[PDB]
């Protein structure tokens, strides 16, 4: 989820 | 044409959390391949090109609840130099094969830094304004790679 658009933190 | 499975969808959006505009931009994504948070894909399903609407997406269908286990207590020595290890600062750790893992600094005390690996929006309900700019069919290479070419933010 953390990689999903529109707001991607990364992981 | 309408948003649906295996379509490449271009949206313009504004993202607000508790009345503060946090983000605003335009992106293209391949629909139905877990490329976009589920509550937003659900709101977009079946929408026509040219539709514009506002949607509330609870944390559960956005970036998920805040996971308490994503908060760690690490040594200040792991931070380089003497950088700006203050609350709100963002750093990247790397795992054994070099994958970068982003964190936000929460607190510093002694030789210990409390850090948060959660997504910054974990636990937040998200308010969007969304405009469907374009919908098209995906190419074979897009459905093979699982993502639009190019994907992500125009702006
Ligand atoms: Cl994509
Ligand atoms: Ni790997
Ligand atoms: Ni317009």
Numbering used by the authors:
A (entry chain B): 5 to 15
B (entry chain A): 1 to 155
The authors write:
The original S2 peptide sequence (NH2-TRYWNPKMKPFIFGA-COOH) was modified such that the first proline residue was changed to alanine (P6A), a leucine residue was placed upstream of the second proline residue (K9L) and the isoleucine residue was mutated to alanine (I12A), resulting in the pseudo-wild-type (psWT) peptide:NH2-TRYWNAKMLPFAFGA-COOH. Although most of the protein–peptide complexes did not crystallize or yielded crystals of poor diffraction quality, we succeeded in structure determination for four complexes of SlyDWT with bound substrates: psWT, W4A, W4K, and M8A. In all structures, the peptide substrates are bound in the PPIase binding pocket with the proline residue in cis conformation, coordinated by the previously observed protein–peptide polar interactions, namely N35-L9, I37-L9, Y63-F11, H119-F11 and Y92-F13. Although all peptide substrates bound to both SlyDWT domains in solution, the chaperone domains displayed no electron density for peptide substrates psWT and M8A in their respective crystal structures. The absence of these substrates in the high-affinity chaperone domains can be attributed to high dynamics of substrate binding and serendipitous blocking of the binding site by neighbouring molecule of SlyD in the crystal packing. Finally, the residue W4 of psWT peptide could not be resolved, indicating flexibility of the peptide N-terminus. Finally, the loose conformation is defined by the newly determined structures with the substrate bound only in the FKBP domain. In these structures, the access to the FKBP binding site is not restricted and the peptides bound in the FKBP domain can freely diffuse from the binding site upon its release.
